Design a binder for this molecule. Structure first.
Ligand SMILES: CC[C@H](C)[C@@H]([C@@H](CC(=O)N1CCC[C@H]1[C@H](OC)[C@@H](C)C(=O)N[C@H](C)[C@@H](O)c1ccccc1)OC)N(C)C(=O)[C@@H](NC(=O)[C@@H](NC)C(C)C)C(C)C
Ligand SMILES: Nc1nc2c(ncn2[C@@H]2O[C@H](COP(=O)(O)OP(=O)(O)O)[C@@H](O)[C@H]2O)c(=O)[nH]1
Ligand SMILES: [Mg+2]
Lengths: 430, 69
Protein backbone atom coordinates (compact mmCIF):
# COMPACT_ATOMS: atom_id res chain seq x y z
CA UNK A 1 0.00 0.00 0.00
CA UNK A 2 2.41 2.61 -1.31
CA UNK A 3 0.03 5.13 -2.85
CA UNK A 4 0.64 7.31 -5.87
CA UNK A 5 -1.43 10.49 -6.35
CA UNK A 6 -2.04 11.31 -10.03
CA UNK A 7 -2.60 14.87 -11.33
CA UNK A 8 -3.52 15.79 -14.90
CA UNK A 9 -3.48 19.44 -16.05
CA UNK A 10 -4.56 21.34 -19.18
CA UNK A 11 -5.90 19.92 -22.42
CA UNK A 12 -3.07 17.55 -23.31
CA UNK A 13 -2.61 16.53 -19.68
CA UNK A 14 -6.25 15.54 -19.28
CA UNK A 15 -6.45 13.86 -22.69
CA UNK A 16 -3.49 11.53 -22.10
CA UNK A 17 -4.34 11.28 -18.40
CA UNK A 18 -7.84 10.04 -19.16
CA UNK A 19 -6.47 7.54 -21.70
CA UNK A 20 -3.99 6.29 -19.08
CA UNK A 21 -6.86 5.58 -16.69
CA UNK A 22 -8.90 3.81 -19.38
CA UNK A 23 -5.96 1.62 -20.30
CA UNK A 24 -4.88 0.59 -16.81
CA UNK A 25 -8.46 0.22 -15.55
CA UNK A 26 -8.98 -2.41 -18.24
CA UNK A 27 -5.69 -4.10 -17.26
CA UNK A 28 -6.75 -4.27 -13.64
CA UNK A 29 -10.26 -5.48 -14.53
CA UNK A 30 -12.01 -2.31 -13.35
CA UNK A 31 -15.02 -1.25 -15.39
CA UNK A 32 -16.25 2.34 -16.05
CA UNK A 33 -18.43 2.15 -12.93
CA UNK A 34 -15.47 1.24 -10.72
CA UNK A 35 -16.54 -2.39 -10.29
CA UNK A 36 -13.89 -5.12 -10.49
CA UNK A 37 -14.66 -7.88 -12.96
CA UNK A 38 -11.31 -9.50 -13.66
CA UNK A 39 -10.19 -13.13 -13.54
CA UNK A 40 -6.77 -12.90 -11.88
CA UNK A 41 -5.56 -12.12 -8.36
CA UNK A 42 -2.50 -10.45 -9.93
CA UNK A 43 -4.83 -7.66 -11.01
CA UNK A 44 -5.79 -6.64 -7.50
CA UNK A 45 -2.60 -7.35 -5.54
CA UNK A 46 -1.24 -3.79 -5.87
CA UNK A 47 -4.45 -2.08 -7.03
CA UNK A 48 -4.15 0.31 -4.09
CA UNK A 49 -1.11 1.98 -5.70
CA UNK A 50 -3.44 3.84 -8.09
CA UNK A 51 -6.96 3.21 -6.69
CA UNK A 52 -8.89 4.02 -3.54
CA UNK A 53 -11.46 1.51 -2.32
CA UNK A 54 -15.04 2.58 -1.64
CA UNK A 55 -18.01 0.63 -0.23
CA UNK A 56 -19.64 -1.84 -2.61
CA UNK A 57 -16.03 -2.65 -3.40
CA UNK A 58 -15.80 0.29 -5.78
CA UNK A 59 -12.37 1.30 -7.02
CA UNK A 60 -11.74 5.03 -7.51
CA UNK A 61 -8.67 6.43 -9.29
CA UNK A 62 -6.46 8.51 -7.00
CA UNK A 63 -6.63 11.16 -9.71
CA UNK A 64 -7.06 14.92 -9.66
CA UNK A 65 -8.22 16.65 -12.85
CA UNK A 66 -7.14 20.27 -13.33
CA UNK A 67 -7.75 22.89 -15.98
CA UNK A 68 -8.23 26.63 -16.36
CA UNK A 69 -11.07 26.11 -18.88
CA UNK A 70 -13.91 23.57 -18.63
CA UNK A 71 -13.86 22.06 -22.16
CA UNK A 72 -11.59 18.98 -21.90
CA UNK A 73 -12.84 18.02 -18.46
CA UNK A 74 -16.43 18.25 -19.63
CA UNK A 75 -15.29 15.92 -22.44
CA UNK A 76 -13.75 13.53 -19.94
CA UNK A 77 -16.78 13.57 -17.64
CA UNK A 78 -18.87 12.65 -20.68
CA UNK A 79 -16.40 10.04 -21.91
CA UNK A 80 -16.62 6.27 -21.38
CA UNK A 81 -14.74 6.33 -18.09
CA UNK A 82 -16.11 9.69 -16.98
CA UNK A 83 -18.07 8.30 -14.03
CA UNK A 84 -15.04 6.52 -12.60
CA UNK A 85 -13.44 9.71 -11.33
CA UNK A 86 -14.24 11.30 -7.97
CA UNK A 87 -16.54 14.25 -8.81
CA UNK A 88 -14.95 16.51 -6.17
CA UNK A 89 -11.57 15.86 -7.78
CA UNK A 90 -12.52 17.91 -10.86
CA UNK A 91 -10.95 21.33 -10.26
CA UNK A 92 -11.46 23.92 -12.97
CA UNK A 93 -11.61 27.59 -13.88
CA UNK A 94 -13.32 29.48 -16.71
CA UNK A 95 -10.72 31.96 -17.96
CA UNK A 96 -8.38 29.61 -19.80
CA UNK A 97 -4.63 30.20 -20.06
CA UNK A 98 -4.41 31.30 -23.73
CA UNK A 99 -1.31 29.12 -24.41
CA UNK A 100 0.57 31.41 -22.06
CA UNK A 101 2.97 30.02 -19.43
CA UNK A 102 2.78 33.26 -17.43
CA UNK A 103 -1.01 33.01 -17.22
CA UNK A 104 -0.73 29.43 -16.00
CA UNK A 105 2.17 30.03 -13.54
CA UNK A 106 1.59 33.55 -12.26
CA UNK A 107 -1.85 35.03 -12.81
CA UNK A 108 -4.78 32.78 -13.86
CA UNK A 109 -3.24 29.60 -12.37
CA UNK A 110 -2.39 31.33 -9.10
CA UNK A 111 -6.07 32.08 -8.57
CA UNK A 112 -6.91 28.35 -8.89
CA UNK A 113 -3.90 26.54 -7.36
CA UNK A 114 -5.01 26.50 -3.65
CA UNK A 115 -8.24 24.68 -4.65
CA UNK A 116 -6.13 22.03 -6.34
CA UNK A 117 -3.80 21.67 -3.37
CA UNK A 118 -6.85 21.21 -1.14
CA UNK A 119 -7.82 18.14 -3.17
CA UNK A 120 -4.23 16.90 -3.30
CA UNK A 121 -4.11 17.17 0.49
CA UNK A 122 -7.37 15.23 0.94
CA UNK A 123 -5.98 12.43 -1.22
CA UNK A 124 -2.57 12.38 0.50
CA UNK A 125 -4.15 12.29 3.98
CA UNK A 126 -6.06 9.18 2.94
CA UNK A 127 -2.78 7.36 2.11
CA UNK A 128 -1.38 4.52 4.21
CA UNK A 129 2.09 5.43 2.90
CA UNK A 130 2.22 7.92 0.02
CA UNK A 131 5.11 7.40 -2.45
CA UNK A 132 4.72 10.56 -4.40
CA UNK A 133 3.02 12.15 -7.34
CA UNK A 134 2.70 11.73 -11.05
CA UNK A 135 1.71 14.59 -13.31
CA UNK A 136 0.59 14.49 -16.96
CA UNK A 137 0.83 17.72 -18.95
CA UNK A 138 2.17 19.27 -22.14
CA UNK A 139 5.02 21.79 -21.99
CA UNK A 140 3.87 23.78 -25.00
CA UNK A 141 0.57 25.28 -23.78
CA UNK A 142 -0.30 27.43 -20.79
CA UNK A 143 -2.19 25.43 -18.14
CA UNK A 144 -0.33 22.12 -18.20
CA UNK A 145 2.98 23.88 -18.68
CA UNK A 146 2.65 26.95 -16.45
CA UNK A 147 0.11 25.86 -13.90
CA UNK A 148 1.47 22.30 -13.97
CA UNK A 149 4.94 23.45 -12.92
CA UNK A 150 3.43 25.85 -10.39
CA UNK A 151 1.67 22.84 -8.84
CA UNK A 152 4.88 20.82 -8.86
CA UNK A 153 6.64 23.52 -6.87
CA UNK A 154 3.79 23.90 -4.34
CA UNK A 155 3.50 20.14 -3.86
CA UNK A 156 7.26 19.89 -3.31
CA UNK A 157 6.96 22.54 -0.59
CA UNK A 158 4.24 20.58 1.25
CA UNK A 159 5.68 17.11 0.52
CA UNK A 160 9.43 17.67 0.21
CA UNK A 161 10.41 14.06 0.92
CA UNK A 162 8.09 12.44 -1.66
CA UNK A 163 8.96 11.49 -5.25
CA UNK A 164 7.74 13.77 -8.07
CA UNK A 165 7.30 12.08 -11.45
CA UNK A 166 6.02 13.63 -14.72
CA UNK A 167 4.90 12.58 -18.15
CA UNK A 168 5.74 15.73 -20.06
CA UNK A 169 4.69 16.23 -23.68
CA UNK A 170 7.29 18.26 -25.62
CA UNK A 171 6.06 20.55 -28.43
CA UNK A 172 7.02 20.20 -32.05
CA UNK A 173 6.25 22.44 -35.06
CA UNK A 174 5.35 19.15 -36.78
CA UNK A 175 2.21 19.01 -34.64
CA UNK A 176 1.55 22.61 -33.48
CA UNK A 177 1.70 25.97 -35.26
CA UNK A 178 1.41 28.01 -32.06
CA UNK A 179 4.47 30.28 -32.18
CA UNK A 180 5.10 30.71 -28.42
CA UNK A 181 5.43 27.00 -27.55
CA UNK A 182 9.26 27.08 -27.36
CA UNK A 183 8.96 29.87 -24.77
CA UNK A 184 6.44 27.88 -22.69
CA UNK A 185 8.51 24.73 -22.98
CA UNK A 186 11.82 26.39 -22.03
CA UNK A 187 10.27 28.07 -18.98
CA UNK A 188 8.82 24.66 -17.99
CA UNK A 189 12.05 22.67 -18.47
CA UNK A 190 13.73 25.15 -16.13
CA UNK A 191 11.15 24.15 -13.50
CA UNK A 192 11.43 20.40 -14.23
CA UNK A 193 15.24 20.35 -13.93
CA UNK A 194 14.95 21.75 -10.42
CA UNK A 195 11.78 20.10 -9.09
CA UNK A 196 11.09 16.65 -10.51
CA UNK A 197 12.80 13.35 -9.69
CA UNK A 198 11.84 11.61 -12.92
CA UNK A 199 10.45 13.04 -16.17
CA UNK A 200 9.39 10.91 -19.15
CA UNK A 201 10.07 13.00 -22.25
CA UNK A 202 7.15 12.37 -24.52
CA UNK A 203 7.99 14.16 -27.73
CA UNK A 204 5.18 15.13 -30.15
CA UNK A 205 7.81 15.18 -32.88
CA UNK A 206 8.54 11.47 -32.33
CA UNK A 207 4.85 10.60 -31.89
CA UNK A 208 3.92 12.23 -35.20
CA UNK A 209 6.83 10.64 -37.06
CA UNK A 210 5.98 7.14 -35.75
CA UNK A 211 2.37 7.60 -36.88
CA UNK A 212 3.34 8.95 -40.29
CA UNK A 213 6.43 6.89 -41.14
CA UNK A 214 5.90 3.60 -39.38
CA UNK A 215 2.15 3.27 -38.91
CA UNK A 216 1.57 4.84 -42.35
CA UNK A 217 -1.13 7.20 -41.07
CA UNK A 218 -1.26 9.97 -43.65
CA UNK A 219 -3.23 12.35 -41.40
CA UNK A 220 -2.26 11.59 -37.79
CA UNK A 221 -4.75 12.72 -35.14
CA UNK A 222 -4.32 13.38 -31.41
CA UNK A 223 -6.13 10.05 -30.93
CA UNK A 224 -3.33 8.34 -32.85
CA UNK A 225 -0.64 10.22 -30.93
CA UNK A 226 -2.28 9.43 -27.60
CA UNK A 227 -2.55 5.76 -28.46
CA UNK A 228 1.27 5.69 -28.39
CA UNK A 229 1.39 7.70 -25.19
CA UNK A 230 -1.04 5.48 -23.29
CA UNK A 231 0.78 2.31 -24.43
CA UNK A 232 4.02 3.85 -23.14
CA UNK A 233 2.46 5.01 -19.85
CA UNK A 234 1.05 1.55 -19.29
CA UNK A 235 4.45 -0.04 -19.95
CA UNK A 236 6.52 2.28 -17.81
CA UNK A 237 4.13 1.95 -14.81
CA UNK A 238 3.86 -1.85 -15.05
CA UNK A 239 6.51 -2.43 -12.33
CA UNK A 240 4.64 -0.07 -10.00
CA UNK A 241 1.28 -1.81 -10.54
CA UNK A 242 2.00 -5.53 -10.56
CA UNK A 243 3.94 -7.84 -8.21
CA UNK A 244 7.65 -7.63 -8.98
CA UNK A 245 11.29 -7.33 -8.01
CA UNK A 246 12.68 -4.42 -9.97
CA UNK A 247 11.80 -0.72 -9.86
CA UNK A 248 8.68 -1.62 -7.90
CA UNK A 249 8.24 1.90 -6.47
CA UNK A 250 9.03 5.45 -7.55
CA UNK A 251 12.06 5.89 -5.27
CA UNK A 252 13.78 2.61 -6.20
CA UNK A 253 13.27 3.51 -9.87
CA UNK A 254 14.91 6.92 -9.33
CA UNK A 255 17.88 5.42 -7.47
CA UNK A 256 18.41 3.00 -10.39
CA UNK A 257 17.92 5.59 -13.17
CA UNK A 258 19.27 8.93 -11.91
CA UNK A 259 23.05 9.05 -11.31
CA UNK A 260 23.14 12.87 -11.11
CA UNK A 261 20.09 14.84 -9.86
CA UNK A 262 19.55 17.14 -12.89
CA UNK A 263 19.85 14.29 -15.41
CA UNK A 264 16.44 12.76 -14.79
CA UNK A 265 14.88 13.07 -18.24
CA UNK A 266 14.07 9.69 -19.73
CA UNK A 267 13.65 8.50 -23.31
CA UNK A 268 10.81 5.93 -23.41
CA UNK A 269 10.37 3.30 -26.08
CA UNK A 270 7.86 0.57 -26.89
CA UNK A 271 7.40 -2.53 -29.02
CA UNK A 272 5.51 -3.53 -31.00
CA UNK A 273 4.34 -0.18 -32.40
CA UNK A 274 0.66 -0.42 -33.32
CA UNK A 275 -2.09 1.91 -34.50
CA UNK A 276 -5.56 1.85 -32.96
CA UNK A 277 -7.52 -1.11 -34.30
CA UNK A 278 -4.60 -2.54 -36.29
CA UNK A 279 -5.32 -5.63 -34.17
CA UNK A 280 -2.36 -7.70 -35.32
CA UNK A 281 -2.30 -11.46 -35.34
CA UNK A 282 1.36 -12.43 -35.02
CA UNK A 283 3.07 -12.09 -31.65
CA UNK A 284 6.62 -10.80 -31.70
CA UNK A 285 9.43 -13.13 -30.69
CA UNK A 286 11.63 -12.21 -27.77
CA UNK A 287 14.47 -11.29 -30.17
CA UNK A 288 12.06 -9.10 -32.15
CA UNK A 289 10.86 -7.30 -29.02
CA UNK A 290 14.42 -6.69 -27.93
CA UNK A 291 15.67 -5.40 -31.30
CA UNK A 292 12.65 -3.13 -31.83
CA UNK A 293 12.49 -1.73 -28.27
CA UNK A 294 16.06 -0.40 -28.64
CA UNK A 295 15.52 0.88 -32.21
CA UNK A 296 15.55 4.67 -32.84
CA UNK A 297 12.25 4.27 -34.69
CA UNK A 298 10.56 3.03 -31.52
CA UNK A 299 11.65 5.91 -29.24
CA UNK A 300 9.00 8.36 -27.98
CA UNK A 301 11.63 11.12 -27.91
CA UNK A 302 13.02 12.29 -31.27
CA UNK A 303 16.63 11.62 -30.35
CA UNK A 304 19.05 9.20 -32.00
CA UNK A 305 20.38 6.98 -29.18
CA UNK A 306 23.41 6.23 -31.38
CA UNK A 307 24.40 9.91 -31.01
CA UNK A 308 24.78 9.51 -27.26
CA UNK A 309 25.47 6.96 -24.53
CA UNK A 310 23.18 5.19 -22.08
CA UNK A 311 23.75 6.16 -18.46
CA UNK A 312 21.06 3.73 -17.27
CA UNK A 313 18.32 1.60 -18.82
CA UNK A 314 15.18 -0.13 -17.57
CA UNK A 315 13.49 -2.74 -19.78
CA UNK A 316 10.09 -4.26 -19.06
CA UNK A 317 8.80 -7.36 -20.83
CA UNK A 318 5.10 -8.30 -20.67
CA UNK A 319 3.40 -11.56 -21.56
CA UNK A 320 4.07 -15.27 -21.25
CA UNK A 321 7.59 -15.87 -22.51
CA UNK A 322 10.86 -17.58 -21.67
CA UNK A 323 12.73 -15.61 -19.03
CA UNK A 324 15.85 -17.45 -20.18
CA UNK A 325 15.41 -16.05 -23.70
CA UNK A 326 14.75 -12.58 -22.31
CA UNK A 327 18.01 -12.64 -20.30
CA UNK A 328 19.97 -13.96 -23.28
CA UNK A 329 18.61 -11.30 -25.65
CA UNK A 330 19.10 -8.44 -23.23
CA UNK A 331 22.70 -9.54 -22.68
CA UNK A 332 23.12 -9.72 -26.46
CA UNK A 333 22.08 -6.07 -26.94
CA UNK A 334 24.60 -4.91 -24.35
CA UNK A 335 27.42 -7.18 -25.49
CA UNK A 336 26.82 -6.32 -29.19
CA UNK A 337 26.64 -2.54 -28.64
CA UNK A 338 28.67 -2.18 -25.47
CA UNK A 339 30.19 1.10 -26.63
CA UNK A 340 26.80 2.82 -26.21
CA UNK A 341 26.61 2.03 -22.51
CA UNK A 342 28.84 4.13 -20.26
CA UNK A 343 31.55 1.86 -18.89
CA UNK A 344 31.78 3.69 -15.56
CA UNK A 345 28.33 2.51 -14.50
CA UNK A 346 28.70 -1.29 -14.41
CA UNK A 347 25.60 -3.41 -15.13
CA UNK A 348 23.47 -0.33 -15.86
CA UNK A 349 20.68 -2.19 -17.67
CA UNK A 350 17.93 -3.75 -15.52
CA UNK A 351 15.16 -6.02 -16.78
CA UNK A 352 11.70 -6.78 -15.42
CA UNK A 353 9.21 -9.38 -16.67
CA UNK A 354 5.46 -9.24 -15.99
CA UNK A 355 3.17 -12.17 -16.92
CA UNK A 356 0.18 -10.00 -17.83
CA UNK A 357 0.33 -8.64 -21.39
CA UNK A 358 -1.31 -5.36 -22.35
CA UNK A 359 -4.73 -5.51 -24.05
CA UNK A 360 -4.56 -6.72 -27.63
CA UNK A 361 -0.99 -8.06 -27.50
CA UNK A 362 0.46 -11.42 -26.51
CA UNK A 363 3.91 -9.91 -26.15
CA UNK A 364 5.26 -6.43 -25.61
CA UNK A 365 8.30 -4.63 -24.25
CA UNK A 366 8.88 -1.18 -22.84
CA UNK A 367 12.18 0.68 -22.75
CA UNK A 368 13.20 3.50 -20.39
CA UNK A 369 16.52 5.11 -21.23
CA UNK A 370 18.55 7.74 -19.43
CA UNK A 371 20.57 8.62 -22.55
CA UNK A 372 22.85 11.61 -23.14
CA UNK A 373 21.25 11.78 -26.60
CA UNK A 374 18.22 13.45 -25.00
CA UNK A 375 20.31 16.65 -25.35
CA UNK A 376 19.16 16.71 -29.00
CA UNK A 377 15.60 17.35 -27.81
CA UNK A 378 16.64 20.26 -25.56
CA UNK A 379 18.86 21.66 -28.30
CA UNK A 380 15.88 21.62 -30.69
CA UNK A 381 13.73 23.59 -28.23
CA UNK A 382 16.62 25.95 -27.45
CA UNK A 383 17.17 26.79 -31.15
CA UNK A 384 13.47 27.62 -31.61
CA UNK A 385 13.53 29.68 -28.41
CA UNK A 386 16.58 31.73 -29.44
CA UNK A 387 15.29 32.42 -32.96
CA UNK A 388 12.46 34.46 -31.39
CA UNK A 389 14.11 35.64 -28.19
CA UNK A 390 17.05 37.31 -29.96
CA UNK A 391 14.44 39.76 -31.34
CA UNK A 392 12.32 39.67 -28.17
CA UNK A 393 9.47 38.53 -30.40
CA UNK A 394 6.08 37.80 -28.78
CA UNK A 395 7.44 38.73 -25.35
CA UNK A 396 4.68 41.30 -24.74
CA UNK A 397 2.23 38.44 -24.10
CA UNK A 398 4.42 37.50 -21.10
CA UNK A 399 5.55 40.88 -19.85
CA UNK A 400 1.85 41.83 -19.88
CA UNK A 401 1.38 39.26 -17.10
CA UNK A 402 4.17 40.79 -15.02
CA UNK A 403 7.17 38.74 -16.24
CA UNK A 404 10.58 40.30 -16.94
CA UNK A 405 12.94 39.31 -19.81
CA UNK A 406 15.50 38.24 -17.16
CA UNK A 407 13.36 35.26 -16.32
CA UNK A 408 13.56 34.09 -19.94
CA UNK A 409 17.36 34.56 -19.96
CA UNK A 410 17.71 32.48 -16.77
CA UNK A 411 15.50 29.67 -18.13
CA UNK A 412 17.44 29.58 -21.39
CA UNK A 413 20.78 29.55 -19.56
CA UNK A 414 19.63 26.70 -17.32
CA UNK A 415 18.51 24.56 -20.24
CA UNK A 416 21.72 25.24 -22.15
CA UNK A 417 23.62 24.19 -18.99
CA UNK A 418 21.57 20.96 -18.90
CA UNK A 419 22.59 20.28 -22.52
CA UNK A 420 26.23 20.87 -21.67
CA UNK A 421 26.05 18.52 -18.69
CA UNK A 422 24.76 15.68 -20.88
CA UNK A 423 27.57 16.29 -23.35
CA UNK A 424 30.04 16.17 -20.46
CA UNK A 425 29.02 12.63 -19.43
CA UNK A 426 28.76 11.60 -23.07
CA UNK A 427 32.46 12.34 -23.49
CA UNK A 428 33.43 10.98 -20.07
CA UNK A 429 36.12 8.07 -19.65
CA UNK A 430 36.73 5.36 -17.08
CA UNK B 1 10.04 31.37 -5.27
CA UNK B 2 6.74 32.29 -3.54
CA UNK B 3 7.97 35.86 -2.97
CA UNK B 4 8.83 36.06 -6.67
CA UNK B 5 5.34 34.80 -7.65
CA UNK B 6 3.78 37.50 -5.50
CA UNK B 7 6.01 40.15 -7.06
CA UNK B 8 5.10 39.11 -10.62
CA UNK B 9 1.34 39.37 -10.10
CA UNK B 10 1.62 42.68 -8.17
CA UNK B 11 3.74 43.95 -11.08
CA UNK B 12 1.02 42.96 -13.56
CA UNK B 13 -1.61 44.81 -11.49
CA UNK B 14 0.58 47.90 -11.08
CA UNK B 15 1.31 48.20 -14.79
CA UNK B 16 -2.40 47.78 -15.69
CA UNK B 17 -3.33 50.44 -13.14
CA UNK B 18 -0.65 52.78 -14.36
CA UNK B 19 -1.83 52.39 -17.94
CA UNK B 20 -5.37 53.37 -16.89
CA UNK B 21 -4.03 56.26 -14.81
CA UNK B 22 -1.98 57.74 -17.65
CA UNK B 23 -4.74 57.24 -20.22
CA UNK B 24 -7.09 59.02 -17.82
CA UNK B 25 -4.71 61.94 -17.27
CA UNK B 26 -3.75 62.32 -20.96
CA UNK B 27 -7.40 62.54 -21.91
CA UNK B 28 -8.30 65.12 -19.23
CA UNK B 29 -5.35 67.22 -20.36
CA UNK B 30 -6.35 67.02 -24.03
CA UNK B 31 -9.98 67.86 -23.32
CA UNK B 32 -9.11 70.86 -21.15
CA UNK B 33 -6.62 72.20 -23.70
CA UNK B 34 -9.18 71.80 -26.53
CA UNK B 35 -11.91 73.50 -24.51
CA UNK B 36 -9.68 76.48 -23.80
CA UNK B 37 -8.49 76.77 -27.37
CA UNK B 38 -11.99 76.65 -28.89
CA UNK B 39 -13.32 79.14 -26.35
CA UNK B 40 -10.42 81.49 -27.14
CA UNK B 41 -11.14 81.30 -30.87
CA UNK B 42 -14.81 82.17 -30.31
CA UNK B 43 -13.87 84.96 -27.87
CA UNK B 44 -11.56 86.53 -30.46
CA UNK B 45 -14.24 86.32 -33.15
CA UNK B 46 -16.78 88.05 -30.93
CA UNK B 47 -14.18 90.64 -29.95
CA UNK B 48 -13.65 91.60 -33.60
CA UNK B 49 -17.41 91.83 -34.26
CA UNK B 50 -17.83 94.03 -31.20
CA UNK B 51 -15.13 96.36 -32.53
CA UNK B 52 -17.21 96.65 -35.71
CA UNK B 53 -20.19 97.73 -33.60
CA UNK B 54 -18.06 100.38 -31.90
CA UNK B 55 -16.74 101.59 -35.25
CA UNK B 56 -20.31 101.89 -36.55
CA UNK B 57 -21.22 104.03 -33.53
CA UNK B 58 -18.39 106.38 -34.40
CA UNK B 59 -19.53 106.62 -38.02
CA UNK B 60 -22.97 107.75 -36.90
CA UNK B 61 -21.39 110.05 -34.31
CA UNK B 62 -19.25 111.48 -37.10
CA UNK B 63 -22.30 112.06 -39.31
CA UNK B 64 -24.12 113.84 -36.49
CA UNK B 65 -21.09 116.07 -35.89
CA UNK B 66 -20.88 116.99 -39.57
CA UNK B 67 -24.58 117.75 -39.88
CA UNK B 68 -25.23 121.10 -38.15
CA UNK B 69 -22.06 122.68 -39.57
C1 LIG C 1 -0.90 17.09 -36.64
C2 LIG C 1 -1.65 18.04 -35.71
C3 LIG C 1 -3.02 17.55 -35.33
C4 LIG C 1 -2.82 16.15 -34.65
C5 LIG C 1 -4.01 17.44 -36.52
C6 LIG C 1 -5.26 16.76 -35.96
C7 LIG C 1 -5.93 17.47 -34.76
C8 LIG C 1 -6.87 16.43 -34.23
O1 LIG C 1 -6.50 15.25 -34.21
N1 LIG C 1 -7.96 16.83 -33.64
C9 LIG C 1 -8.61 18.15 -33.35
C10 LIG C 1 -9.34 17.81 -31.98
C11 LIG C 1 -10.10 16.75 -32.64
C12 LIG C 1 -8.90 15.87 -33.11
C13 LIG C 1 -9.45 14.61 -33.89
O2 LIG C 1 -10.27 15.11 -35.01
C14 LIG C 1 -9.48 15.54 -36.13
C15 LIG C 1 -10.30 13.61 -33.16
C16 LIG C 1 -10.78 12.55 -34.19
C17 LIG C 1 -9.43 12.91 -32.10
O3 LIG C 1 -8.35 12.44 -32.43
N2 LIG C 1 -9.96 12.85 -30.90
C18 LIG C 1 -9.26 12.22 -29.78
C19 LIG C 1 -9.67 10.73 -29.71
C20 LIG C 1 -9.61 12.97 -28.49
O4 LIG C 1 -9.07 12.23 -27.39
C21 LIG C 1 -9.15 14.31 -28.49
C22 LIG C 1 -7.80 14.53 -28.26
C23 LIG C 1 -7.25 15.80 -28.22
C24 LIG C 1 -8.09 16.90 -28.42
C25 LIG C 1 -9.46 16.69 -28.63
C26 LIG C 1 -9.99 15.40 -28.66
O5 LIG C 1 -6.34 16.74 -36.98
C27 LIG C 1 -5.98 15.91 -38.15
N3 LIG C 1 -4.19 18.79 -37.12
C28 LIG C 1 -4.56 20.00 -36.32
C29 LIG C 1 -3.98 18.93 -38.44
O6 LIG C 1 -3.64 17.98 -39.17
C30 LIG C 1 -4.18 20.34 -39.06
N4 LIG C 1 -2.92 20.57 -39.76
C31 LIG C 1 -1.94 21.30 -39.21
O7 LIG C 1 -2.09 21.88 -38.12
C32 LIG C 1 -0.68 21.45 -40.06
N5 LIG C 1 -0.20 22.84 -40.08
C33 LIG C 1 -1.22 23.67 -40.77
C34 LIG C 1 0.46 20.52 -39.50
C35 LIG C 1 0.84 20.90 -38.05
C36 LIG C 1 0.00 19.06 -39.51
C37 LIG C 1 -5.35 20.26 -40.04
C38 LIG C 1 -6.64 20.02 -39.29
C39 LIG C 1 -5.45 21.62 -40.78
N1 LIG D 1 0.20 14.26 -27.83
C1 LIG D 1 -0.79 15.16 -27.57
N2 LIG D 1 -0.47 16.48 -27.62
C2 LIG D 1 -1.40 17.42 -27.36
C3 LIG D 1 -2.77 17.04 -27.07
N3 LIG D 1 -3.47 18.18 -26.87
C4 LIG D 1 -2.62 19.23 -27.05
N4 LIG D 1 -1.38 18.76 -27.31
C5 LIG D 1 -0.15 19.55 -27.50
O1 LIG D 1 0.01 20.33 -26.28
C6 LIG D 1 0.52 21.62 -26.66
C7 LIG D 1 -0.58 22.65 -26.34
O2 LIG D 1 -0.89 22.53 -24.94
P1 LIG D 1 -2.32 22.25 -24.34
O3 LIG D 1 -2.29 21.13 -23.35
O4 LIG D 1 -3.29 22.21 -25.46
O5 LIG D 1 -2.52 23.65 -23.53
P2 LIG D 1 -3.12 23.81 -22.03
O6 LIG D 1 -4.55 23.36 -22.05
O7 LIG D 1 -2.90 25.30 -21.85
O8 LIG D 1 -2.22 23.00 -21.13
C8 LIG D 1 0.78 21.59 -28.17
O9 LIG D 1 2.16 21.29 -28.38
C9 LIG D 1 -0.16 20.51 -28.67
O10 LIG D 1 0.34 19.90 -29.86
C10 LIG D 1 -3.05 15.60 -27.06
O11 LIG D 1 -4.21 15.24 -26.81
N5 LIG D 1 -2.05 14.75 -27.30
MG1 LIG E 1 -5.04 23.66 -26.66
Amino acid sequence: MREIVHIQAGQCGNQIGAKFWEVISDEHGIDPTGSYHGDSDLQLERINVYYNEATGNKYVPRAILVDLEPGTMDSVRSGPFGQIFRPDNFVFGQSGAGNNWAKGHYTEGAELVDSVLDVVRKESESCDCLQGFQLTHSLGGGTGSGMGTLLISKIREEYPDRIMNTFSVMPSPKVSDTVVEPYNATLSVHQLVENTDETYCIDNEALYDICFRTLKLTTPTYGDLNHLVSATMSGVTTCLRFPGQLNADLRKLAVNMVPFPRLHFFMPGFAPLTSRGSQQYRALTVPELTQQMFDSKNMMAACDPRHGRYLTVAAIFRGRMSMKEVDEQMLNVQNKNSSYFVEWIPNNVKTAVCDIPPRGLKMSATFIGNSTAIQELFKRISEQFTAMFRRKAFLHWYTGEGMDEMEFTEAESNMNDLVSEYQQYQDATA
Amino acid sequence: KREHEREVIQKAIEENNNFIKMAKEKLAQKMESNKENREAHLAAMLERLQEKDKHAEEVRKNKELKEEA
